Amino acid sequence: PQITLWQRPLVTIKIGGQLKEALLDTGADDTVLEEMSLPGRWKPKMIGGIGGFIKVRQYDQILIEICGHKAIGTVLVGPTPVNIIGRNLLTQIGCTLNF
Amino acid sequence: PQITLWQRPLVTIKIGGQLKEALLDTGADDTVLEEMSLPGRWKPKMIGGIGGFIKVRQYDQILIEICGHKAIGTVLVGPTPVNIIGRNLLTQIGCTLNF
Ligand SMILES: CC(C)CN(C[C@@H](O)[C@H](Cc1ccccc1)NC(=O)O[C@H]1[C@H]2CO[C@H]3OC[C@@H]1[C@H]3C2)S(=O)(=O)c1ccc2nc(NC3CC3)sc2c1
């Protein structure tokens, strides 16, 4: 699809058997999801944004279906206010900016 | 242009007579620039991001030239770690997401 930006660019995702809504976020290097139950091993990590830093759990090789496109990569889980799909996964689904 | 996302989508902007680089950020509702000298009146504002909140100065009807495209709108100025072009200006230059 082509998505204009008059509203937030939210898409439906399926991850870890669960359905969520997430923001397609070109300003985000990595993918950060609100606290959720994910299986397997993870590594602690701190990431920074507009208001400071948050502690997240880093999960690697996680499968996500983003608006019907499959991708596998690192997902960060923690106290973000919004689920964010970052460039690490946007590149896999072929997402581009155009103007 | 079309911009792929293997690197950060940075563009050159001109605002208030100054040249800056800023991130084209679909996850940002509004435009937030690092501390800089702007001329007009302003209003105190507080905005929230991944790690908490920051205090910014809100300037309205500010002219920005973003990758050579002109837009006028609200710019927030404060302790953001990176200059962000948000959807309030992305819509004005015709920016879309495509996949
Ligand atoms: C700041 C930006 C450069 C980074 N961010 C992505 C933005 O898209 C963010 C998404 C968001 C939306 C809503 C709430 C929280 C966050 N946008 C935002 O903060 O917008 C704010 C302000 C703007 O206008 C309104 O719109 C929303 C509000 C509001 C006021 S991130 O999330 O911090 C972020 C994401 C991924 C990431 N990966 C890293 N890896 C490490 C480096 C190797 S670091 C890292 C940081």
Residue numbers in the entry:
A (entry chain B), B (entry chain A): 1 to 99
What does the publication say?
Dimerization of HIV-1 protease (PR) subunits is an essential process for PR’s acquisition of proteolytic activity, which plays a critical role in the maturation of HIV-1. We have previously demonstrated that PR monomer subunits initially interact at the active site interface, generating unstably dimerized PR subunits, and subsequently the termini interface interactions occur, completing the dimerization process. Since our first report of darunavir (DRV) in 2003, we continued optimization based on the structure of DRV, seeking novel protease inhibitors (PIs) that are more potent against a variety of existing multi-PI-resistant HIV-1 variants with greater safety, do not permit or substantially delay the emergence of HIV-1 variants resistant to the very PIs, and favorably penetrate into the CNS, and identified GRL-142.
GRL-121 contains both Crn-THF and Cp-Abt moieties and more effectively blocked the replication of cHIVNL4-3WT by about 10-fold compared to DRV. GRL-121 more potently suppressed the replication of all three HIVDRVRs. GRL-121 exerted highly potent activity with IC50 values of 0.028 to 12 nM, while GRL-142 again showed even more potent activity with IC50 values of 0.0052 to 0.69 nM. GRL-121 was again found to be highly potent against all the variants examined with IC50 values of 0.015 to 350 pM. The development of DRV-resistant HIV-1 variants was significantly delayed and concentrations above 0.1 µM DRV still inhibited replication at week-36. However, cHIVNL4-3WT failed to propagate in the presence of >0.01 μM of GRL-121 and >0.003 μM of GRL-142 even at week 36, indicating that HIV-1 failed to select any meaningful resistant substitutions.
